[PDB]
Coordinates of C-alpha atoms and ligand atoms in Angstrom, one line a residue:
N1 CA 30.0 -6.7 -42.6
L2 CA 33.7 -7.5 -41.7
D3 CA 33.7 -3.8 -41.5
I4 CA 31.8 -3.9 -38.3
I5 CA 32.3 -7.3 -36.7
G6 CA 36.4 -7.9 -38.3
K7 CA 38.3 -6.3 -35.3
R8 CA 36.4 -8.5 -32.8
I9 CA 37.5 -11.5 -35.1
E10 CA 40.8 -10.1 -36.1
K11 CA 41.5 -9.5 -32.2
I12 CA 39.9 -13.4 -31.4
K13 CA 42.3 -15.2 -34.5
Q14 CA 45.9 -13.1 -32.9
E15 CA 44.9 -14.9 -29.7
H16 CA 44.6 -17.8 -31.2
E17 CA 47.0 -17.8 -34.4
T18 CA 48.5 -21.2 -33.0
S19 CA 45.6 -23.2 -33.6
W20 CA 43.4 -20.9 -36.3
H21 CA 41.8 -23.5 -38.7
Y22 CA 39.4 -22.8 -41.3
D23 CA 37.4 -26.1 -40.6
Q24 CA 35.8 -27.4 -44.1
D25 CA 33.6 -29.9 -42.4
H26 CA 31.9 -26.5 -40.3
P27 CA 28.2 -26.9 -40.0
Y28 CA 26.8 -23.7 -40.0
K29 CA 24.2 -23.0 -42.6
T30 CA 22.2 -19.9 -42.0
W31 CA 25.3 -18.8 -39.7
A32 CA 28.6 -17.0 -41.2
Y33 CA 31.7 -18.9 -40.5
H34 CA 34.6 -17.4 -39.7
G35 CA 37.5 -19.8 -38.0
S36 CA 38.2 -22.4 -35.4
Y37 CA 40.7 -22.9 -32.3
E38 CA 41.7 -25.4 -29.7
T39 CA 40.2 -24.6 -26.2
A40 CA 26.9 -28.4 -15.5
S41 CA 23.7 -30.7 -14.7
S42 CA 21.1 -30.0 -12.0
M43 CA 22.5 -31.3 -8.2
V44 CA 19.4 -32.5 -5.6
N45 CA 18.0 -30.3 -2.4
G46 CA 18.5 -32.6 0.4
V47 CA 16.3 -31.1 3.0
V48 CA 13.6 -30.4 0.2
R49 CA 13.8 -34.1 -1.0
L50 CA 14.2 -35.6 3.1
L51 CA 10.9 -33.7 3.6
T52 CA 8.9 -34.8 0.1
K53 CA 9.3 -38.6 0.4
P54 CA 6.3 -39.6 -1.2
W55 CA 7.1 -37.5 -4.6
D56 CA 10.3 -40.2 -4.6
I57 CA 8.2 -42.9 -6.3
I58 CA 6.7 -40.1 -8.8
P59 CA 8.5 -40.4 -12.1
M60 CA 7.0 -36.9 -13.2
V61 CA 9.1 -35.5 -10.1
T62 CA 12.1 -37.8 -9.8
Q63 CA 13.1 -37.4 -13.7
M64 CA 13.0 -33.6 -13.7
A65 CA 16.6 -34.1 -11.5
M66 CA 18.3 -35.9 -14.5
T67 CA 20.6 -35.3 -17.1
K68 CA 20.7 -26.2 -31.1
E69 CA 19.5 -26.9 -34.7
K70 CA 16.7 -24.0 -34.2
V71 CA 19.5 -21.3 -34.0
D72 CA 20.7 -22.4 -37.4
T73 CA 17.4 -21.6 -39.2
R74 CA 17.1 -18.5 -41.1
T75 CA 14.0 -16.2 -41.4
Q76 CA 12.1 -14.7 -44.5
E77 CA 11.9 -11.1 -45.0
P78 CA 8.1 -9.6 -44.5
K79 CA 6.4 -8.3 -47.6
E80 CA 5.9 -4.1 -48.1
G81 CA 2.6 -4.3 -46.5
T82 CA 3.9 -5.9 -43.1
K83 CA 7.0 -4.0 -42.8
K84 CA 4.9 -0.9 -43.2
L85 CA 2.1 -1.9 -40.6
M86 CA 5.4 -2.8 -38.1
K87 CA 7.0 0.6 -38.8
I88 CA 4.3 2.4 -38.1
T89 CA 2.9 0.7 -34.9
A90 CA 6.7 1.0 -33.6
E91 CA 6.8 4.2 -34.1
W92 CA 3.6 5.1 -32.6
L93 CA 4.1 2.3 -29.2
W94 CA 7.9 4.0 -28.5
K95 CA 5.8 7.3 -28.6
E96 CA 3.5 6.2 -26.3
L97 CA 5.6 3.9 -23.9
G98 CA 7.7 7.7 -23.8
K99 CA 4.8 10.1 -23.0
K100 CA 5.6 9.7 -18.9
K101 CA 9.4 8.2 -19.1
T102 CA 12.4 9.9 -19.9
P103 CA 15.5 7.4 -21.6
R104 CA 18.6 8.1 -19.3
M105 CA 22.0 6.1 -18.7
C106 CA 22.0 4.2 -16.3
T107 CA 25.6 4.7 -14.0
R108 CA 28.7 2.6 -12.5
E109 CA 27.4 2.9 -9.2
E110 CA 23.7 1.4 -10.2
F111 CA 25.7 -1.1 -12.0
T112 CA 28.4 -2.1 -9.1
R113 CA 25.2 -1.9 -6.6
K114 CA 23.8 -4.9 -8.8
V115 CA 26.6 -7.0 -8.8
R116 CA 27.0 -6.5 -5.0
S117 CA 23.7 -7.8 -4.8
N118 CA 24.1 -11.0 -6.8
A119 CA 21.7 -10.9 -10.1
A120 CA 22.5 -12.8 -13.3
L121 CA 23.9 -10.2 -15.3
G122 CA 24.7 -13.1 -17.9
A123 CA 28.4 -12.3 -17.7
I124 CA 31.8 -14.9 -18.3
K125 CA 42.7 -11.4 -14.5
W126 CA 39.3 -11.3 -12.3
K127 CA 37.4 -13.9 -10.6
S128 CA 33.8 -12.9 -9.6
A129 CA 31.9 -9.8 -11.3
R130 CA 32.5 -8.6 -7.7
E131 CA 36.2 -8.2 -8.6
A132 CA 36.5 -6.7 -11.7
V133 CA 34.0 -3.4 -10.9
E134 CA 36.0 -3.2 -7.4
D135 CA 39.4 -2.5 -9.9
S136 CA 39.9 0.7 -11.9
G137 CA 41.7 -1.5 -14.3
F138 CA 38.4 -3.0 -15.6
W139 CA 36.8 0.6 -16.2
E140 CA 39.7 1.9 -18.3
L141 CA 39.0 -1.4 -20.4
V142 CA 35.3 -0.2 -20.2
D143 CA 36.4 3.4 -21.2
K144 CA 38.4 2.0 -24.5
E145 CA 35.2 -0.1 -25.6
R146 CA 33.4 2.7 -24.8
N147 CA 35.2 5.6 -27.0
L148 CA 35.6 3.0 -29.8
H149 CA 31.5 2.4 -29.5
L150 CA 31.4 6.9 -29.6
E151 CA 33.7 5.9 -32.4
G152 CA 31.5 3.4 -34.2
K153 CA 33.5 0.7 -33.7
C154 CA 33.6 -2.1 -31.5
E155 CA 36.5 -4.9 -30.4
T156 CA 36.0 -6.7 -27.6
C157 CA 31.6 -7.3 -27.3
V158 CA 31.6 -11.0 -28.5
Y159 CA 28.5 -13.6 -27.9
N160 CA 29.5 -17.2 -26.1
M161 CA 26.2 -19.5 -26.6
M162 CA 25.6 -22.0 -23.9
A163 CA 20.3 -20.4 -25.9
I164 CA 22.3 -18.0 -23.1
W165 CA 24.6 -15.9 -24.8
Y166 CA 26.9 -15.1 -22.2
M167 CA 29.2 -12.0 -22.7
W168 CA 32.0 -10.6 -20.7
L169 CA 30.8 -7.7 -17.7
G170 CA 32.1 -5.1 -19.6
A171 CA 30.2 -5.7 -22.5
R172 CA 27.3 -6.2 -20.3
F173 CA 28.0 -2.7 -18.6
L174 CA 27.6 -1.1 -21.7
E175 CA 24.6 -3.0 -22.6
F176 CA 23.1 -2.0 -19.4
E177 CA 24.7 2.0 -19.7
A178 CA 22.7 2.3 -22.6
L179 CA 19.2 0.2 -22.7
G180 CA 19.1 -0.7 -18.9
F181 CA 16.7 2.5 -18.4
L182 CA 13.8 0.1 -19.6
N183 CA 13.9 -2.6 -16.7
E184 CA 15.0 0.0 -14.3
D185 CA 12.5 2.6 -15.0
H186 CA 9.4 0.4 -15.5
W187 CA 9.0 1.2 -19.4
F188 CA 6.6 -2.3 -19.5
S189 CA 5.6 -2.0 -16.3
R190 CA 0.9 -2.4 -16.9
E191 CA 1.1 1.6 -15.7
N192 CA 3.4 2.8 -18.7
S193 CA 2.5 -0.2 -21.3
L194 CA -1.2 -1.2 -21.0
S195 CA -0.3 -4.7 -22.0
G196 CA 2.7 -5.1 -19.9
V197 CA 3.2 -6.8 -16.5
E198 CA 6.7 -5.9 -15.6
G199 CA 7.3 -5.8 -12.0
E200 CA 4.1 -7.6 -11.1
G201 CA 4.3 -10.9 -9.1
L202 CA 2.5 -13.9 -9.7
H203 CA -0.2 -12.7 -7.0
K204 CA -1.0 -9.9 -9.6
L205 CA -1.4 -11.8 -12.6
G206 CA -4.5 -14.0 -12.2
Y207 CA -6.1 -10.4 -11.3
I208 CA -5.0 -8.9 -14.5
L209 CA -6.3 -11.4 -16.6
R210 CA -9.7 -11.6 -14.6
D211 CA -9.9 -7.6 -15.5
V212 CA -9.0 -8.1 -19.0
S213 CA -11.9 -10.8 -19.0
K214 CA -14.2 -8.2 -17.8
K215 CA -14.1 -6.3 -21.9
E216 CA -16.9 -7.1 -24.5
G217 CA -15.3 -9.1 -27.0
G218 CA -14.2 -12.6 -28.2
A219 CA -12.5 -15.7 -26.7
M220 CA -9.1 -15.5 -24.8
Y221 CA -6.3 -16.2 -27.4
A222 CA -2.8 -17.3 -25.6
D223 CA -0.7 -18.7 -28.5
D224 CA 2.8 -19.3 -27.6
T225 CA 5.2 -18.7 -31.0
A226 CA 8.1 -21.6 -31.5
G227 CA 11.1 -20.3 -30.6
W228 CA 10.3 -16.7 -30.5
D229 CA 14.3 -15.4 -30.4
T230 CA 14.9 -17.5 -33.2
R231 CA 11.8 -15.6 -35.1
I232 CA 13.4 -12.1 -34.6
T233 CA 13.9 -10.2 -37.7
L234 CA 16.3 -7.7 -39.0
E235 CA 13.2 -5.1 -39.7
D236 CA 12.1 -6.1 -35.9
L237 CA 15.4 -5.1 -34.5
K238 CA 15.4 -1.9 -36.5
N239 CA 11.9 -1.1 -35.1
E240 CA 13.3 -1.8 -31.8
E241 CA 16.5 0.4 -32.5
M242 CA 13.8 3.4 -33.3
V243 CA 14.2 4.1 -29.2
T244 CA 17.2 6.1 -29.7
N245 CA 14.9 8.6 -31.5
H246 CA 13.8 9.7 -28.3
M247 CA 17.4 10.2 -26.7
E248 CA 19.7 13.0 -27.2
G249 CA 24.0 13.7 -26.8
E250 CA 26.0 11.1 -25.5
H251 CA 23.0 8.4 -24.4
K252 CA 21.9 8.6 -28.0
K253 CA 25.1 7.7 -29.5
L254 CA 26.1 4.8 -27.1
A255 CA 22.5 3.3 -27.6
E256 CA 22.7 3.7 -31.3
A257 CA 26.5 1.6 -31.1
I258 CA 24.7 -0.9 -28.9
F259 CA 21.8 -1.8 -31.4
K260 CA 24.1 -1.2 -34.7
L261 CA 27.6 -3.2 -33.3
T262 CA 26.2 -6.1 -31.2
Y263 CA 22.5 -6.9 -32.1
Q264 CA 22.0 -5.5 -35.8
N265 CA 25.9 -7.5 -36.0
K266 CA 26.9 -10.2 -33.5
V267 CA 30.0 -12.2 -33.5
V268 CA 29.4 -15.7 -31.2
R269 CA 32.1 -18.3 -29.9
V270 CA 30.2 -21.9 -29.7
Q271 CA 32.1 -25.1 -28.1
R272 CA 31.5 -28.0 -30.9
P273 CA 32.8 -31.7 -29.9
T274 CA 33.9 -32.5 -33.0
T275 CA 37.0 -29.3 -29.5
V276 CA 37.2 -26.7 -31.6
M277 CA 35.7 -22.9 -30.7
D278 CA 33.6 -21.6 -34.3
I279 CA 33.3 -18.2 -34.6
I280 CA 29.9 -17.3 -36.1
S281 CA 28.0 -14.5 -36.9
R282 CA 24.4 -13.2 -38.1
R283 CA 22.6 -10.1 -38.3
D284 CA 19.5 -11.2 -37.3
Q285 CA 17.4 -13.2 -34.1
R286 CA 17.6 -12.1 -30.5
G287 CA 20.9 -12.7 -28.5
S288 CA 20.9 -9.5 -26.0
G289 CA 21.2 -9.9 -22.1
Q290 CA 18.2 -11.8 -20.7
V291 CA 16.7 -8.3 -18.9
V292 CA 17.6 -6.0 -22.3
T293 CA 15.6 -9.2 -24.3
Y294 CA 12.5 -9.5 -21.8
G295 CA 11.5 -5.4 -22.5
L296 CA 12.3 -5.6 -26.4
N297 CA 10.7 -9.0 -26.8
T298 CA 7.7 -7.3 -24.8
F299 CA 7.7 -4.2 -27.2
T300 CA 8.0 -6.3 -30.3
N301 CA 5.1 -8.9 -29.0
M302 CA 2.7 -5.9 -28.2
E303 CA 3.6 -4.6 -31.6
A304 CA 2.6 -7.7 -33.2
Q305 CA -0.5 -8.7 -31.1
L306 CA -2.0 -5.0 -32.0
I307 CA -1.1 -5.6 -35.8
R308 CA -2.8 -9.2 -35.1
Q309 CA -6.1 -7.4 -33.8
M310 CA -6.0 -5.0 -36.7
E311 CA -6.1 -7.3 -39.3
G312 CA -8.7 -8.7 -37.2
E313 CA -10.4 -5.9 -37.5
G314 CA -10.4 -5.2 -41.1
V315 CA -7.9 -2.0 -40.8
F316 CA -6.0 -3.1 -44.1
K317 CA -7.0 -5.6 -46.5
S318 CA -3.5 -7.2 -47.4
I319 CA 0.0 -7.4 -46.2
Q320 CA 1.4 -7.5 -49.9
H321 CA 1.1 -3.7 -50.0
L322 CA -0.6 -0.8 -48.0
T323 CA -2.8 1.8 -49.9
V324 CA -2.0 5.3 -48.6
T325 CA -5.5 5.6 -47.3
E326 CA -4.8 2.3 -45.4
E327 CA -1.2 3.7 -43.7
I328 CA -3.6 6.8 -42.6
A329 CA -6.7 4.2 -41.1
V330 CA -4.3 2.2 -39.5
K331 CA -2.5 5.7 -37.9
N332 CA -6.2 7.1 -37.1
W333 CA -7.2 3.6 -35.7
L334 CA -3.7 3.7 -33.4
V335 CA -4.3 7.2 -32.4
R336 CA -8.2 6.8 -32.0
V337 CA -8.3 3.1 -30.3
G338 CA -4.7 2.1 -29.5
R339 CA -4.5 2.2 -25.8
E340 CA -8.1 0.9 -25.2
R341 CA -6.8 -2.4 -27.5
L342 CA -3.2 -2.7 -25.6
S343 CA -5.7 -3.0 -22.4
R344 CA -7.2 -5.9 -24.1
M345 CA -4.2 -7.7 -23.3
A346 CA -1.2 -9.0 -20.9
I347 CA 2.4 -9.3 -22.3
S348 CA 5.3 -11.0 -20.9
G349 CA 8.1 -10.8 -23.1
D350 CA 7.1 -14.1 -26.0
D351 CA 4.3 -14.8 -23.9
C352 CA 0.8 -13.0 -24.3
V353 CA -3.1 -13.2 -23.5
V354 CA -5.3 -11.5 -26.2
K355 CA -9.0 -10.8 -25.4
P356 CA -9.7 -9.2 -29.0
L357 CA -13.2 -7.4 -30.0
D358 CA -14.8 -10.6 -31.9
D359 CA -13.6 -13.4 -33.1
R360 CA -12.2 -12.8 -36.6
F361 CA -8.8 -12.7 -34.6
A362 CA -8.5 -16.2 -34.5
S363 CA -8.4 -16.5 -38.6
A364 CA -6.4 -13.3 -38.8
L365 CA -2.7 -15.1 -39.3
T366 CA -1.5 -13.8 -42.6
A367 CA 0.7 -10.5 -40.8
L368 CA 1.2 -12.7 -37.7
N369 CA 3.0 -15.5 -39.9
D370 CA 4.2 -13.1 -42.8
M371 CA 6.3 -11.1 -39.8
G372 CA 7.8 -15.0 -38.8
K373 CA 6.0 -15.2 -35.5
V374 CA 4.3 -18.8 -36.2
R375 CA 2.4 -20.5 -33.5
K376 CA 3.6 -23.8 -31.9
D377 CA 1.7 -26.8 -32.1
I378 CA -0.7 -25.9 -34.5
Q379 CA -0.9 -25.6 -38.6
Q380 CA 0.3 -22.4 -39.9
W381 CA -3.2 -22.0 -41.4
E382 CA -5.3 -23.7 -39.1
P383 CA -7.7 -20.9 -36.8
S384 CA -6.5 -20.3 -33.3
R385 CA -8.1 -22.3 -30.4
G386 CA -9.7 -19.8 -27.9
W387 CA -10.5 -20.1 -24.5
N388 CA -14.2 -19.4 -22.9
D389 CA -13.1 -19.0 -18.8
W390 CA -10.2 -16.7 -17.7
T391 CA -9.9 -19.3 -15.0
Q392 CA -8.3 -21.7 -17.7
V393 CA -6.3 -19.3 -19.8
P394 CA -2.3 -20.4 -19.7
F395 CA 0.0 -17.4 -19.0
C396 CA 3.7 -17.4 -17.3
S397 CA 3.7 -21.3 -16.6
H398 CA 0.7 -20.9 -14.5
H399 CA -3.6 -21.0 -14.5
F400 CA -5.3 -19.0 -11.7
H401 CA -8.3 -19.7 -9.6
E402 CA -11.1 -17.8 -8.1
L403 CA -11.0 -18.7 -4.1
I404 CA -13.4 -17.3 -1.5
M405 CA -12.6 -16.7 1.8
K406 CA -14.8 -18.1 4.8
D407 CA -15.6 -14.2 5.3
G408 CA -17.0 -14.0 1.9
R409 CA -13.6 -11.8 0.2
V410 CA -12.2 -12.8 -3.0
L411 CA -8.6 -14.2 -3.6
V412 CA -7.3 -14.7 -7.5
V413 CA -4.6 -17.3 -6.8
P414 CA -1.9 -18.7 -9.0
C415 CA -1.6 -22.6 -9.6
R416 CA 0.2 -25.2 -11.6
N417 CA 0.4 -28.6 -11.6
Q418 CA 1.9 -29.5 -8.3
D419 CA 4.5 -31.9 -9.7
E420 CA 6.4 -29.3 -11.3
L421 CA 6.5 -27.1 -8.4
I422 CA 8.0 -29.9 -6.1
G423 CA 10.2 -31.3 -8.8
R424 CA 11.5 -27.5 -9.1
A425 CA 11.9 -27.0 -5.3
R426 CA 14.1 -30.4 -5.1
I427 CA 16.7 -29.3 -7.6
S428 CA 19.5 -26.5 -6.7
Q429 CA 22.2 -25.3 -9.3
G430 CA 25.7 -25.2 -8.3
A431 CA 29.0 -26.3 -6.7
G432 CA 30.3 -25.8 -3.3
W433 CA 26.6 -25.7 -1.5
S434 CA 27.2 -26.1 2.0
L435 CA 24.6 -28.1 4.4
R436 CA 23.5 -24.3 5.6
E437 CA 23.2 -22.9 2.5
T438 CA 21.1 -25.9 0.9
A439 CA 19.0 -25.4 4.0
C440 CA 18.2 -21.9 3.2
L441 CA 17.7 -22.4 -0.6
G442 CA 14.9 -25.0 1.1
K443 CA 13.5 -22.0 2.9
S444 CA 12.9 -19.8 0.0
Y445 CA 11.0 -22.5 -1.7
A446 CA 9.1 -23.0 1.3
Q447 CA 8.3 -19.6 1.8
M448 CA 7.4 -19.3 -1.9
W449 CA 4.9 -22.0 -1.2
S450 CA 3.0 -20.5 1.9
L451 CA 2.8 -16.9 0.1
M452 CA 1.5 -17.9 -3.8
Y453 CA 0.6 -21.8 -3.0
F454 CA -1.0 -21.9 0.3
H455 CA -4.3 -23.1 -1.6
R456 CA -2.3 -26.5 -2.2
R457 CA -2.8 -28.7 0.9
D458 CA 0.7 -30.9 0.0
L459 CA 2.3 -27.8 0.0
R460 CA 1.1 -25.8 2.9
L461 CA 2.0 -28.9 4.7
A462 CA 5.3 -29.1 3.2
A463 CA 6.4 -25.6 3.5
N464 CA 5.3 -25.7 7.3
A465 CA 7.8 -28.6 7.4
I466 CA 10.5 -27.0 5.6
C467 CA 10.3 -23.7 8.1
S468 CA 9.8 -25.9 11.3
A469 CA 13.3 -28.1 9.8
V470 CA 15.4 -25.1 9.5
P471 CA 16.8 -22.9 12.1
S472 CA 14.1 -20.2 12.2
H473 CA 16.4 -17.1 12.0
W474 CA 18.2 -18.7 9.0
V475 CA 18.3 -16.1 6.0
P476 CA 16.5 -17.8 2.6
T477 CA 19.1 -17.6 -0.2
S478 CA 18.7 -17.9 -4.0
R479 CA 22.1 -17.8 -6.2
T480 CA 19.7 -17.8 -9.0
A481 CA 8.1 -11.5 -10.4
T482 CA 8.1 -9.8 -7.1
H483 CA 9.9 -11.9 -4.4
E484 CA 8.2 -11.3 -1.6
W485 CA 9.0 -14.7 0.2
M486 CA 12.5 -13.5 0.2
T487 CA 12.7 -12.4 4.4
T488 CA 12.9 -13.6 7.9
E489 CA 9.6 -11.8 8.4
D490 CA 6.7 -14.0 10.6
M491 CA 4.8 -15.4 6.6
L492 CA 1.2 -14.6 8.1
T493 CA 2.5 -10.9 8.4
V494 CA 3.6 -11.1 4.5
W495 CA 0.5 -12.7 3.5
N496 CA -1.7 -10.2 5.1
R497 CA 0.5 -7.3 3.4
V498 CA 0.3 -9.1 0.0
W499 CA -3.0 -10.5 0.0
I500 CA -5.0 -7.9 2.0
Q501 CA -2.9 -4.3 2.8
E502 CA -1.7 -3.5 -0.4
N503 CA -4.2 -5.8 -2.6
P504 CA -5.9 -3.0 -5.1
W505 CA -8.4 -6.0 -5.6
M506 CA -9.7 -6.2 -1.7
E507 CA -11.9 -3.1 -0.8
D508 CA -12.2 -4.6 3.1
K509 CA -8.6 -4.5 4.6
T510 CA -9.7 -6.6 8.0
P511 CA -6.7 -8.6 8.3
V512 CA -6.2 -12.3 8.8
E513 CA -5.7 -13.8 12.5
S514 CA -4.6 -17.1 11.5
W515 CA -3.5 -19.6 8.7
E516 CA -6.9 -21.6 9.5
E517 CA -8.7 -18.1 7.8
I518 CA -6.9 -19.2 4.3
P519 CA -8.5 -21.1 2.3
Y520 CA -7.7 -24.1 -0.1
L521 CA -8.8 -25.2 -2.9
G522 CA -11.6 -27.6 -3.3
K523 CA -10.6 -31.2 -2.4
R524 CA -11.3 -32.3 -6.1
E525 CA -9.8 -29.1 -7.7
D526 CA -6.5 -29.8 -5.6
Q527 CA -6.4 -34.0 -6.8
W528 CA -7.1 -32.0 -10.5
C529 CA -4.2 -30.1 -10.2
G530 CA -1.7 -33.0 -9.0
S531 CA -2.6 -33.1 -5.3
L532 CA -1.8 -36.7 -3.6
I533 CA -4.7 -35.9 -0.7
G534 CA -6.6 -39.6 -0.9
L535 CA -3.1 -41.4 -1.0
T536 CA -2.1 -44.0 1.6
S537 CA 1.9 -42.8 0.8
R538 CA 0.1 -39.4 1.4
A539 CA -1.6 -39.8 4.6
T540 CA 1.5 -41.7 6.1
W541 CA 3.8 -38.5 5.4
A542 CA 1.2 -36.3 7.1
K543 CA 0.6 -38.1 10.3
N544 CA 4.6 -38.9 10.7
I545 CA 5.5 -35.6 9.7
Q546 CA 7.2 -34.7 12.8
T547 CA 9.5 -37.8 12.3
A548 CA 10.7 -36.6 9.2
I549 CA 11.6 -32.9 10.5
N550 CA 13.1 -34.3 13.5
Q551 CA 15.3 -36.3 10.5
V552 CA 16.3 -33.1 8.8
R553 CA 16.9 -31.5 12.3
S554 CA 19.3 -34.0 13.6
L555 CA 21.4 -33.9 10.3
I556 CA 21.8 -29.8 10.5
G557 CA 22.6 -30.2 14.3
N558 CA 21.8 -28.0 17.6
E559 CA 20.3 -25.1 16.3
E560 CA 16.8 -23.0 17.2
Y561 CA 14.2 -24.2 15.6
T562 CA 10.2 -23.2 15.6
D563 CA 7.5 -26.0 15.3
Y564 CA 5.1 -24.4 12.6
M565 CA 2.8 -27.5 12.1
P566 CA 0.1 -26.6 14.8
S567 CA -1.0 -23.7 12.5
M568 CA -2.2 -26.0 10.7
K569 CA -6.1 -27.4 12.1
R570 CA -4.9 -31.2 12.2
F571 CA -1.5 -30.6 14.2
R572 CA -3.4 -28.4 16.3
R573 CA -3.6 -31.1 19.6
Ligands
B1A1 C1 -6.7 -30.0 5.0 C2 -7.4 -31.0 4.6 O1 -8.5 -30.6 4.2 N1 -6.9 -31.9 4.2 C3 -7.4 -33.1 3.4 C4 -8.5 -33.1 2.7 C5 -9.0 -34.4 2.1 C6 -8.3 -35.9 2.2 N2 -8.6 -36.9 1.3 C7 -9.4 -36.6 0.0 C8 -9.1 -35.8 -0.5 C9 -9.9 -35.8 -1.9 C10 -11.4 -37.0 -2.0 C11 -11.3 -38.1 -1.2 C12 -10.0 -37.8 0.0 C13 -7.0 -35.4 2.5 C14 -6.3 -34.4 3.6
CL2 CL1 -12.0 -22.8 -21.8
ZN3 ZN1 32.0 -3.0 -28.1
ZN4 ZN1 -4.9 -25.4 -10.4

C-alpha cells in the first residue's frame, strides 16, 4: 500500500498543504481516497460540412457534433482453477510471442523522434512535448525517477483521469523505454501472434476475416466485453508482468518497476465539481498508456479466448479447481493445437472474432464470466449469438463486403453505416485551426474515403469534391490502422499500390488505368449501408456539385486547384 504510493501522495500534499482537506463527503467506494486540494467540446469542420449539404438535415450526422460510475466498480477474485488456466496459458503465450522476437529498451532517440512527429503519447516549465525533449533539464528529472525505479520506488508517476489517464512526458518516456518494444517491434503482428492484427490497415481486415471463415468449425463469435479496461483483474496484471521473465539486466528491473509501481499500484488525480482535486489509489483495472494498453489488452484477450475455446472443447471440467492431470492436458492442448487455435481468431485489443472448432463455444461461459470478462448486451448465462457469414461479422467498428471488379478480380472492402463516416469527417478536435489547416484535415478524410470507401457512391463523389475544393499541393494533416491516404501522391497510384501491387490476396497484378474500372457496392446494398442515392436532396447536390466546390474555393481564395469530378462517368462531359 502506502509503502509504494505514499511518496507520490506526500509530494502532491506538500505542494498543496495550503488546501489539503480529507473531504468526508467523497463519493469513492472501490477507489481508495487520500485527500483533496483547490484547483473540450467538438468543433465543426466547415470545409467538409459545406460539401455535404444533404446531411445538414440528417440527425444521425448533425447530433454527432453536439455536446464515470463504471470505474468505481470492483472485480471479484477468480477461482483457483481459473487462476491456474490463466497462468499456464499466459506462460505459454509469452514464450510463443517471444520465439522470434527479442525484448529490448526503447531509447531517448526513438522517443524524441516520435514527439517531433506528433503522436498521442497521452502526456500533460515546458509548453509542448517538443520543448521538454530539447531541454537537458527534463532528462535529469527522468534520470532521478529512473534511478528511483531501479531503487524499487516511485515519486512522479501519477495518472490524471479525463476514460483516458494522461501522465507527464517523463513517466510516459519511462513506460516507452521499458515496454515500447511490444508495439515498436510488432509483437502483436499477425506474423508473430497468429490472432493479432497490429499494423494491418482497414484494407487487410476483411481478407483476414475471410481467411478465418475458410477454417472448418462453428459460427463466428464476436462478443464485446462491457468496459473491458474496468474488468482487468490483479491476476491479469500479474500474468502480463511475466513478459519480464524474458528480459535481462537493467531492462528487466526497469520493466518490473513499471508493472509493480505504476500498473499494479496506481495514483490518480480526478476533477470533482463539488473544485477539489481527489488523490485516489487502486491496484487493479487498466490505466497505462494507450499503445501499451492496446498490446496488453490484445495479450489478455488472446489468453481469455484460448481458455474459452478450451472450455468448449472439454479440456477441463470445472473452474473451481484443476486436477494435476487437467494441468498436463491444458499444457498438452497448447503445445499440440495452441498455434492452430490462435489462427482461428482476429483480436484487436478488447475486440475479437473467434471461429471455434464447433458451437459448444456458444455456451462455454464459466471461465469467461469468472475471469470477469462479462459480455455486453446479453444475459450472463445466455449462449452467445454467432454469425453464419463472415460478411456480417462486426470487427473494429466495420463489416466487410466481397466486391467483384468488371475484370473478375475480388476486392474485400471495409464498410460502416455512412452517417457515421460523414458525421466523423465533419468534426475537428482542438483550438486555433486556420482555414488552411481545416481544409487539409478535410483533405485527409477525403483521401481516406477514396482509398477505403470508394465503393460508396456518395463518399467517392464527396471525396472528389473535397479534393477539387482544396488546393492540389496542400498536404493532408491530422493532430489526432496504416494511414496510406496521408500523402500528396495521386490517389489512383496509391489505390493501385494498396489494392493490387501489395495485396497478397490478388494474384493478377494488372494495374487499373482509371477510377471507372473501380466498382461500387450494388445500388440496394449502398442504400442498406446508409447511401442517399435515390433521394431528391442527393440528386440536386450531385448535379450542382461544381457550385459547392466553387463556394469553398472562393472562401480559401486564389490558389492552384485541380478538378477531380471528371474521374467519375457522370461528370465526364
Ligand atoms: C454512379 C451511380 O451508380 N449512381 C447512382 C445510381 C443510382 C441512383 N439512384 C437509385 C439508387 C437505388 C435505387 C433507385 C435509384 C443514383 C445514383
Ligand atoms: Cl449471419
Ligand atoms: Zn515513477
Ligand atoms: Zn456495408
